[PDB]
């Protein structure tokens, strides 16, 4: 388990430390690719195919948990087989950039990010479902224990193995940076490796974004059900009534979080707040319901009609100042959990305002 030992034992002396190190990293890449493929085939054989064959769950559920596994496996197997081909021409691997570009650039990039994103985007939700299922269904809990007892699982659970694809993608840039580091500069090789490294980052950003939007969408549907915008079915101040039929489902979420509202000088209101693309929405938790409600102060703010200001004496607090001539003469004074949180909330608030 290590290139200088193993292969390249009589062939080591010939080489520089840099070229030894280059070989090691390339070897790690190859060996951990095959290893990753192994893990996917464990998912296939121990879990997916058995769940399917023995009807452990409705096919509609199973497809959400394992959307495109055979495709995922072939993405990696094909690449793996090209690695084998290249190792065939001797244990000292020469140029590698084209093999990297064949997985991470152009069409091959589009394919990998689509397939990886479809496999991962919904995964946190499917796993929560599986967890529920295990609690509630004895046949299912039993099957999961039996499957996880298989030695191929290496004592891990399904939730610990199914995340391997996301984790594998995060390693490629790091493995490329280290190869690049041990590659002679001024080379086309070197340039093309940098290109591959950069495209891997872009692939991670794409999968990051898919998970974000898929989870956010599911989260906002759940919130919508629990939304009660009833006290705005009437109105007090004019500027609240237009959000009586506020539908969270039709907007994008940027951020969310608890904030304390300093409404007067010795009154506070504990809020949960959504930062959407166009609106900041202030909600009160009330059992399991999310109350959209005045105080008067409006509970919805339009980001195109506000300014954001720090508070010099309170590193956890920030102001929102409504700029409509119909606005309140009062500022919304909001308090975050920490100074860090307040930095985050402000950075994102200012950005969203610039784009509103």
């Amino acid at each position: 388990q290590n290139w200088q030992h193993t292969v390249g034992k009589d062939v080591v002396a010939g080489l520089t430390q840099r070229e030894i190190d280059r070989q090691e990293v390339i070897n790690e890449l190859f060996v951990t690719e095959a290893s990753h493929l192994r893990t996917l085939r464990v998912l296939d054989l121990i879990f997916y195919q058995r769940m399917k064959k023995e009807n452990l769950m409705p096919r509609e559920e199973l497809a959400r948990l394992f959307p495109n596994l055979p495709e995922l496996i072939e993405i990696h197997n094909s690449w793996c087989e090209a690695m084998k081909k290249l190792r065939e021409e001797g244990p000292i691997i020469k140029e590698i950039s084209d093999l990297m570009l064949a997985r991470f650039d152009g069409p091959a990039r589009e394919e990998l990010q689509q397939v990886a994103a479809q496999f991962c985007s919904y995964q946190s939700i499917a796993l929560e479902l599986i967890k529920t299922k295990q609690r509630k269904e004895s046949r299912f809990q039993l099957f999961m224990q039996e499957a996880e007892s298989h030695p191929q699982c290496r004592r891990l659970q399904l939730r610990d193995l199914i995340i391997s694809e996301m984790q594998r993608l995060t390693k490629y840039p790091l493995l490329l940076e280290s190869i690049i580091k041990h590659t002679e500069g001024g080379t086309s090789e070197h340039e093309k490796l940098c290109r591959a490294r950069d495209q891997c980052r872009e692939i991670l950003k794409y999968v990051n974004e898919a998970v974000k939007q898929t989870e956010n969408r599911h989260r906002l549907e759940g919130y919508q059900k629990r939304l009660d915008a009833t006290a705005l079915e009437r109105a007090s101040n004019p500027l609240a009534a237009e959000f009586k039929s506020l539908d969270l489902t039709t907007r994008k979420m940027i951020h969310e979080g608890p904030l304390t509202w300093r409404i007067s000088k010795d009154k506070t209101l504990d809020l949960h707040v959504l930062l959407l693309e166009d609106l900041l929405v202030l909600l009160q938790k009330q059992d399991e319901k999310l109350l959209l409600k005045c105080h008067t102060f409006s509970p919805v703010l339009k980001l195109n009609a506000v300014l954001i200001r720090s508070v010099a004496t309170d590193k956890r607090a920030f102001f929102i100042i409504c700029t409509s001539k119909l606005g309140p003469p009062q500022i919304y004074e909001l308090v975050a959990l920490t100074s860090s949180d307040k930095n985050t909330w402000m950075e994102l608030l200012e950005e969203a305002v610039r784009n509103a």
């Binding site: 290590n2 891990l156 391997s164 984790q167 995060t170 390693k171």
Partner: protein, 178 residues
């Protein structure tokens, strides 16, 4: 079997992966330091008790704010790392990692770890940090951050020497059992 899940978090420069490797192998790797540490179960005994400690690396996830949370569920103990040769990594403890970990792992114990302690007194290091006008982190600063963030404990180690490594994990495991 008592099964616990440990997740290691901190800045990308701070030696997360390598720390997991020496704990798991009881050996600093001589000729080559791997970039990849796969999810893996380690056996460890602490206080009489046998424990299976599922080890999760997060290296490479530091720029991807919606990939990271995927490792968090069912975590039993968090190892939060900075590196003693990087006070920048230390300042991200309260600035980045602590709020994230408290949000996604409420009530999960945290152990703060200062890696690379062998460098507190390496001169190449002292001088480099001279330039940006800094110096190696000191145990008192480490320790104060630990109380600041509500950590269950503070620990320093050096992966290169293996010094304090076992002790890091033993502490993390005790925290998982409480």
């Amino acid at each position: 079997a008592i099964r616990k899940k440990l997740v290691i978090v901190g800045d990308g420069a701070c030696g997360k992966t390598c720390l997991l490797i020496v704990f798991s192998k009881d050996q600093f790797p001589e000729v080559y330091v791997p970039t990849v540490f796969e999810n893996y179960v380690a056996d460890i005994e602490v206080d009489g008790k046998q424990v299976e400690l599922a080890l999760w690396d997060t290296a490479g996830q530091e720029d991807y704010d919606r990939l990271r949370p995927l490792s968090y569920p069912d975590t039993d103990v968090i190892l939060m790392c900075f590196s003693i040769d990087s006070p920048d990594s230390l300042e991200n403890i309260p600035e980045k990692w602590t709020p994230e970990v408290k949000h996604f792992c409420p009530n999960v114990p945290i152990i703060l770890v200062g890696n690379k302690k062998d460098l507190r007194n390496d001169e190449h290091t002292r001088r480099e940090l001279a330039k940006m006008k800094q110096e190696p982190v000191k145990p008192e600063e480490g320790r104060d951050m630990a109380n600041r963030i509500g950590a269950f404990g503070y620990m320093e180690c050096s992966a290169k020497t293996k010094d304090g490594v076992r002790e890091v994990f033993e502490m993390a495991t005790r925290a998982a059992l409480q």
